[PDB]
Design a protein around this ligand. Structure first.
Ligand SMILES: Nc1ncnc2c1ncn2[C@@H]1O[C@H](COP(=O)(O)OP(=O)(O)O)[C@@H](O)[C@H]1O
Ligand SMILES: Nc1ncnc2c1ncn2[C@@H]1O[C@H](COP(=O)(O)OP(=O)(O)O)[C@@H](O)[C@H]1O
Ligand SMILES: [Mg+2]
Ligand SMILES: [Mg+2]
Lengths: 156, 52, 75, 46, 525, 72, 151
């Protein structure tokens, strides 16, 4: 359609890149504490208190991150802990990876509104896929409950 | 077509994991995906930082 | 990129540091083991003197900074 | 020499690390001086 | 001569003053900076801001509301202070239009700067702006359409206004669901304007689409130890008594005896008095008892033995909302049971929301009080959702109070600009230029709306101006694709109150700022 | 730099290059109305492009091989 | 990611960079300030300026010439330096027009700022200005009158 609208500011792009970089740094920080072969992190706060933990929410909230995007990631981990109870590391890793992809998407010249709607569509499709892949379970089956608990404790 | 193919650490490779008893409830992956997508969508709708 | 107000040690560095702290704590009291062991005489920087061979007393009297060494002391 | 109204940006956010690095020492010095001045001048003068 | 540039100095140390050109420069700079900051958050495609606090707490806030943005910024420029107070007062009067009024004032002051640079006395600009404001207000009033008489049409208008208000905010993702929620919540007030009757409860976790409007009411209080956790066909008595070591209000009273047996007798008398008060309460024939203040252990077990729920420490807002939703009367005396109305609801139980337990009232009698549960992924998301819902509720309540509506999408602004231009085309002198600048700012508002979307704003604004000059009075911006469309058909409507308030407040602030030719600052403390 | 959408324009030009055998299709920076650079007479030295690619590859390899920094 | 707005620090102590909007803001501010300063000394009813040297000499010099005004001022804005050198070169080439060229450049840059605010690519502005300059130069040449024959 021609030249199109010129971008005067270039400040929103810098803000988006900074937020994505902070989120990716947080994910790479809590990237080695995932899975049965993950290792615990040791955190020493301003006082003499010492925490050795593998829980993603605990790791994120124990250390002060000082960056806005990192703080939304910490709140995300807290919310995942509230709702599900585990996967607090996986959700943060997923958010960091999504924003890392948004870096290249924005660099390609895509407005950060088509990205949001497309991500919503992908989320709905993925929810459908996960529901399709799922299997029914009943509380009378002790073996499945034991397997779930053992899988939860495998990484601790 | 192997829907249950996953990473096996006991054998150090790829194999079926339902025989390895590695399962988690659906409202872990579903919740994580929904929450991460919502947070990413919220972050994408930000273009400035102001100091109070 | 992390922007965390503090210091971070990762990988072989922190593992070696923890092993160094544990080995130092061990070497503090390694000379007071067995009948041919000999006691230690501690001074509490106010003139107080404590002569002892018990490991628990020695590790409680000392002030330790590294947390991996605090683990051995409380052990 | 215009455009004083800025409202700045995440630039100060990018320098929070050094800001707090200096501010902790400044606060420690202020605490030491406050504990020193609780007696000095407050009683030395009269 | 002047105070600052004089051989002798007349000021305290640290106090100065700014003369005509300098004061005008500083005022215009501050106003333009405020307008540029608050904008880019305007219209459906506006973005949000991050408010990173520099205090010890370092509160983090992500918001789109212009008033909240302008509140939490350290502002030194006095004209910027005027604009911030304008935004705050606009938020107080109506829930929306803060960004619009701020941007309009900034654009008006920019045009004033241009006119002053063109050697025009500010009084001429002010007179022209007064004439333009009168003309634009008359045009907007003539453009208003009312649908209060028709119930279904009024409901459709309410839905359209809620959608338009929520289009800019973060809730635009689930605009349909949130519009239904807000419209139902406002309609449940039965015409009452007390937005405090609508409680917004933010619970972390869950998708934003998981938010819902509860069919009854939710309370975040607890129940006594030995009291039922679930009752049916509840007869609720709402009270505001002490019932905690309740002492006779004779402050000079005391117990003075010669033996401990008398002290024990007096203590037994006090316990008997509390028991008699509980018996008088029970004489009302109630199932659930809600007290505003605390309930101590003795009345707690007395209620438990009678099988009566005793919800304690429900604040003034809590008891007011319970009375609104159940129809009971807040009573502080229990000597006339026949003169006290008891609230009624179908069922009381405990529901499990997130990791917290809340008391759920179901099948309420009156229901003129709503509780909205907000679910989100981050605390910032929850706060922004609450702010957006508050904006929608405020605008819907204003529309319920006054049903006159105007079309959005820049239609009202372009109509006002057309009226102002028509007035200015038949006026001699520089007042015509001032009115032309007024119309230019009015057109600049939808220009910024189109800029925020990356659209061809100049072409769209020219098309809108041509359409409004031709006679198409309902033409407006179609933000779905980037063309002009019929706002009446497309269902983008606003409250006439909001637009009128925005126009008048912006004109007032621009006039008061333009009148200033000297800024004198005392020595800072 | 020319205001066009990068991904869409580049994808269209690449698809055109694949469809018809023409390695001279580029980005119409000046909006002359065509993508063929022969008519637009946009000509670059082969030595320049080869040097660009070679130098970039060598510097990227050198940077990738560095794994430690010991600044004072 | 910007050169300055990145967690990794790539500059020496005191070095800094200004990106698109900031650079345009500073350049336009400096150019407009220079234009406003040099103007009001233009035309038959122009006024003079006082140039107080802050050095040891403390030389005083009242003047109306734009080039002399722009020469003896401490200038730190780079665009202001560009306009000052423009005025100096204009003075070197011909005796007059030092104020007019600076005022014209300042007005052009103010219009450019407005056009940028209207979301117009600067290359489009440059092309339009080149065409306008060609047309204006042709018109001015066509309007010239020569009287070198008659004494
Ligand atoms: N025995 C196992 N074999 C293979 N994968 C596993 C095993 N146990 C856990 N996992 C996987 O490791 C992932 C990370 O879980 P974990 O490390 O506990 O942190 P989080 O629960 O926060 O994701 C889980 O998604 C799970 O699927
Ligand atoms: N769907 C829409 N289509 C066109 N214009 C809209 C739409 N939604 C909102 N607007 C316009 O955006 C302007 C700003 O509204 P908003 O940003 O929600 O609140 P505020 O009035 O506080 O800025 C309003 O004047 C309105 O006319
Ligand atoms: Mg787990
Ligand atoms: Mg609004």
């Amino acid at each position: 359609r021609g030249k199109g609208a010129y971008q005067d500011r270039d400040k929103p792009a810098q803000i988006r890149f900074s937020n994505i970089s902070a989120a990716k740094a947080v994910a790479d920080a809590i990237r080695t504490s995932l899975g049965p072969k993950g290792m615990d992190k040791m955190i020493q706060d301003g006082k003499g208190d010492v925490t050795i933990t593998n829980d993603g929410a605990t790791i994120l909230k124990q250390m002060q991150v000082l960056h806005p995007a990192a703080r939304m990631l910490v709140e995300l981990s807290k919310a995942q802990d509230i709702e599900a109870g585990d996967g607090t590391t996986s959700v943060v890793i997923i958010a960091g990876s999504l924003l890392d992809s948004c870096t290249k998407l924005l660099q390609k010249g895509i407005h950060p509104t088509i990205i949001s709607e497309s991500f919503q569509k992908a989320l709905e499709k993925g929810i459908e896929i996960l529901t399709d892949m799922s299997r029914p379970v009943e509380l009378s089956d002790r073996e499945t409950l034991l397997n779930s608990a053992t899988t939860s404790l495998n990484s601790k | 077509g192997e829907k249950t193919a996953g990473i096996n650490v006991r054998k150090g490779g790829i194999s079926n994991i339902l025989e390895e008893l590695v399962v988690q409830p659906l409202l872990v992956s579903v919740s994580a995906l929904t929450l991460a997508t919502e947070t990413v969508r919220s972050i994408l709708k930000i273009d400035d930082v102001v100091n109070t | 990129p992390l922007s965390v107000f503090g210091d971070r040690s990762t990988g072989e560095t922190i593992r070696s540091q923890n092993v160094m702290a544990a080995a130092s704590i061990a070497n503090i009291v390694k000379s007071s083991l067995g009948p041919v062991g000999l006691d230690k005489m501690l001074v509490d920087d106010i003139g107080d003197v404590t002569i002892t061979n018990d490991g628990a007393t020695i590790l409680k009297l000392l002030e330790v900074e590294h947390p991996a060494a605090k683990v051995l002391c409380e052990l | 020499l215009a455009g004083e109204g800025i409202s700045v940006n995440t630039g100060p956010k990018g320098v929070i690390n050094d800001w707090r690095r200096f501010k902790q020492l400044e606060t420690e010095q202020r605490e030491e001086q406050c504990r020193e001045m609780e007696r000095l001048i407050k009683k030395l003068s009269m | 001569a002047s105070l600052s540039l004089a051989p002798v100095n007349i000021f305290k140390a640290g106090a100065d003053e700014e003369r005509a050109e300098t004061a005008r420069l500083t005022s215009f700079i501050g106003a333009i900076a405020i307008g540029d900051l608050v904008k880019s958050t305007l219209g459906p495609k506006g973005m949000d801001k991050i408010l990173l606090s520099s205090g010890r707490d370092a509160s983090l806030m992500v918001t789109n509301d212009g008033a909240t943005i302008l509140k939490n910024i350290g502002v030194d420029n006095p004209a910027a202070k005027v604009l911030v107070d304008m935004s705050r007062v606009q938020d107080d009067e109506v829930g929306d239009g803060t960004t619009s009024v701020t941007v309009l004032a900034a654009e008006l002051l920019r045009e004033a700067e241009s006119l002053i640079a063109k050697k025009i006395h500010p009084q001429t600009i002010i007179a022209g702006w007064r004439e333009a404001t009168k003309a634009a207000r008359e045009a907007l009033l003539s453009s208003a359409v009312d649908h209060g008489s028709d119930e279904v049409k009024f409901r459709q208008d309410l839905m359209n206004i809620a959608g338009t208000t929520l289009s800019s905010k973060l809730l635009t993702h689930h605009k349909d669901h949130f519009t239904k929620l807000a419209v139902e919540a406002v309609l449940r007030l039965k015409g009452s304007g007390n937005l405090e009757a609508i409680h917004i409860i933010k619970k972390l976790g869950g998708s934003l689409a998981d938010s819902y409007l509860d069919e009854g009411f939710l309370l975040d209080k607890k129940i006594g130890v030995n009291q039922p956790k679930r009752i049916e066909n509840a007869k609720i008595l709402i009270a505001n008594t002490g019932m905690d070591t309740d002492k006779i209000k004779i402050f000079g009273s005391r117990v003075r005896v010669d033996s401990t047996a008398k002290v024990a007798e007096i203590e037994h008398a006090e316990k008997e008095k509390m028991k008699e008060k509980v018996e008088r309460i029970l004489k009302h024939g109630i199932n659930c008892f809600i007290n505003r203040q605390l309930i101590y252990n003795y009345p707690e077990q007395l209620f438990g033995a009678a099988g009566v729920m005793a919800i304690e420490h429900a604040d003034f807002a809590g008891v007011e909302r319970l009375a609104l939703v159940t129809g009971g009367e807040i009573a502080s005396t229990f000597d006339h049971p026949e003169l006290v109305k008891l609230g009624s609801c179908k069922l009381i139980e405990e529901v499990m929301i997130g990791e917290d337990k809340l008391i759920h009232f179901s099948g309420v009698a009156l229901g003129e009080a709503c509780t909205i549960v907000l679910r989100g992924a981050t605390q910032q998301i929850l706060d922004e959702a609450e702010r957006s819902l508050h904006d929608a509720l405020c605008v819907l309540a204003q529309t319920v109070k006054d049903s006159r509506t105007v079309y959005g999408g820049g239609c009202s602004e372009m109509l006002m600009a057309h009226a102002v231009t028509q007035l200015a085309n038949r006026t001699p002198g520089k007042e015509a230029v001032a009115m032309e600048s007024y119309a230019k700012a009015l057109r600049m508002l939808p220009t910024i709306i189109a800029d925020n979307a990356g659209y061809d704003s100049a072409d769209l604004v020219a098309q809108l101006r041509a359409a409004h000059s031709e006679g198409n009075t309902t033409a407006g911006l179609d933000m779905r694709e980037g063309t002009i469309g019929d706002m009446a058909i497309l269902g983008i409507t606003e409250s006439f109150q909001v637009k009128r308030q925005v126009l008048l407040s912006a004109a007032e602030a621009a006039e008061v700022i333009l009148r200033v030719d000297n800024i004198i600052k005392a020595a800072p403390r | 730099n020319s205001g066009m959408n990068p991904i869409q324009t580049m994808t269209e030009v690449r698809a055109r290059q694949v469809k018809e055998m023409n390695p001279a299709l580029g980005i119409d920076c000046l909006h002359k109305g065509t993508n063929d650079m022969k008519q637009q007479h946009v000509i670059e030295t082969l030595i320049g492009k080869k040097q660009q690619i070679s130098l970039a590859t060598q510097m990227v390899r050198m940077i990738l091989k560095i794994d430690d920094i010991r600044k004072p």
